């Protein structure tokens, strides 16, 4: 239900960002690449979030733009790819790279990244191409 956070950056420790909204310091997990776009500590930042709820955990995944949040959400809809794996994918390549690689069935791109899986990569490419046709965005 939390889709956006606007507050002050308190500390950056990739992959974590502590962002204070009110006096509540929230822990947000972001793709490594997103840390090059973040305002310096002490300044205000707007991050798009995805709230993942489980019986034993309440986590927040944060993106600089909505395009990347969409990608992440679709990514974790596939079996074998959870939040942690989706983060590495988006840390390992831009949003545009991933789309370009998926569109031409480039499995080689994905097997380089951390603990992906040869068969999972192929699986990922089929599903994502099917999933991409029903949406919109700046990244396309």
């Amino acid at each position: 239900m939390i889709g956006r956070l606007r507050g002050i950056i308190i500390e950056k420790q990739p992959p974590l960002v502590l962002i204070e909204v009110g006096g509540v310091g929230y822990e947000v997990h972001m793709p490594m690449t997103c840390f090059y776009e973040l305002p310096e500590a002490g300044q205000e930042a707007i991050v798009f979030t995805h709230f993942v709820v489980r019986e034993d955990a309440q986590l927040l995944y944060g993106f600089n733009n909505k395009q990347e949040r969409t990608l992440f959400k679709e990514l974790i809809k596939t079996n074998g790819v959870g939040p942690k794996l989706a983060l590495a994918i988006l840390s390992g390549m831009s949003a545009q790279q991933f789309v370009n690689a998926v569109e031409r069935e480039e499995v080689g791109a994905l097997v380089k990244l951390p603990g992906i899986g040869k068969k999972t990569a192929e699986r990922l490419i089929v599903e994502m191409k099917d999933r991409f046709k029903g949406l919109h965005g700046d990244l396309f």
Copy 2:
């Protein structure tokens, strides 16, 4: 536990509304009809919410008045009718229309709506009327 939200409409993408309360952007799901009654982005809005908690998710369902929220709450108590589907009963037709239908028993009206159920249309009328005599409201 969250009964109401008052904040700034950040964005409106039916069926989602992004309302910022403090610096927390809350995602609210409303019936489509409710969407056209809301102010414009930048302005303050007051929505009556229904919080649904499950193992995998925390969701907010938003309404322009308490009469719609009550109807919503009762709709989802019947079997085969979840939030997704109850949204359509108030998305596809106003609140006022629906209550007449149950009291008069017009099954034809409710069958046109999105994937409801011809027997569930019957089910709704039967089931809804019992609950309708135990409440109060402007909708009546």
Copy 3:
């Protein structure tokens, strides 16, 4: 983790109270007797809360003072007595009445209240007397 709420009273509909903190309207469930102590709608109120979390629900129980919250918490530690039953007990008699009745093994007091239970009353009286010796408060 939420132990207190300080905000504006928006509406009172026993057993519910909507109290707005920030722009977040929180639903609080209080014993009927507590409604005679609540500031009028539009004014600030401080309520002591008990957060009950279950897989499908997130609820807030609110008291005017900490003594009553303690009582409620101990009450629901007994089998057969859940939040709903503990509310009726505290709606049916003051905090002092309940302690006075428990101390002299007065089961008659408790069987009058709504859906208690003859055997549950006796059970309640034994446990509460044992439980009362390890605490403190204005009500004693």
Copy 4:
């Protein structure tokens, strides 16, 4: 998801601290030692929190610095050591003491503490040292 709280200390009843952030009084559980380092009621405090979520409960564990929070997090990963018990390891003895004990392997020190375990004392030392070489901090 909540990494830090900044607000007004409302009350201090070891082991609970009531800190008001906005109008929300949050209950924070801290090790007893941490309790004597906190400011007085009425003043602002900054605490590093660890949020534990379970089916029946939402809890906040609070610390005066990140070194104690890290130690806490690692303590509760070992079997037979829950939050209740880890509080005592930092309540009964400082953070600094404990890390020496694991590196030197002094089992006598940790057996005095509240109901730990003579074999669990051994367990702690054995188990803790593996984890201690994979981190960083002022406590070291």
